[PDB]
Amino acid sequence: HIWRGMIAKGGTPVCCARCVPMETKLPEVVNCSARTDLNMLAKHYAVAIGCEIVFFVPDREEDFASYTEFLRYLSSKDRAGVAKLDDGTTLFLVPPSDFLTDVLQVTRQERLYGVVLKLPPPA
Secondary structure, three states: OOOEEEEEEOOEEEEEEEEEEOOOOOOOEEEEOEEEEHHHHHHHHHHOOEEEEEEEEEOOHHHHHHHHHHHHHHHOOOEEEEEEOOOOOEEEEEOOOOHHHHOOOOOOOOOEEEEEEEOOOOO
16 A cells, blocks of 8 residues: 555646655645745754655656656755645655755655654653
């Protein structure tokens, strides 16, 4: 049982997608309801105590051109997308860039990363 669903931008479908791990349940639709500057995410990362990652791949070939285009839509502007898991956790949609190696310090891949940051809990 793999995750298979849709990605959307502002409620507007972008493509269908699947998901390989490196986590809670992904909704049927991962909607990118907003963007965040990579700088802003860098600040949350600096203090995070968990950083979980999945890769989103286009589901089928007909989803490729859109997936690719959605990557440039994010990386152009040095931004990341914002979506949610089922349980309300913030999920960031991070396209390929230096940010992946300099800040998250992970291997870089020409893939969209889903990223959840766990910040410190209260005392």
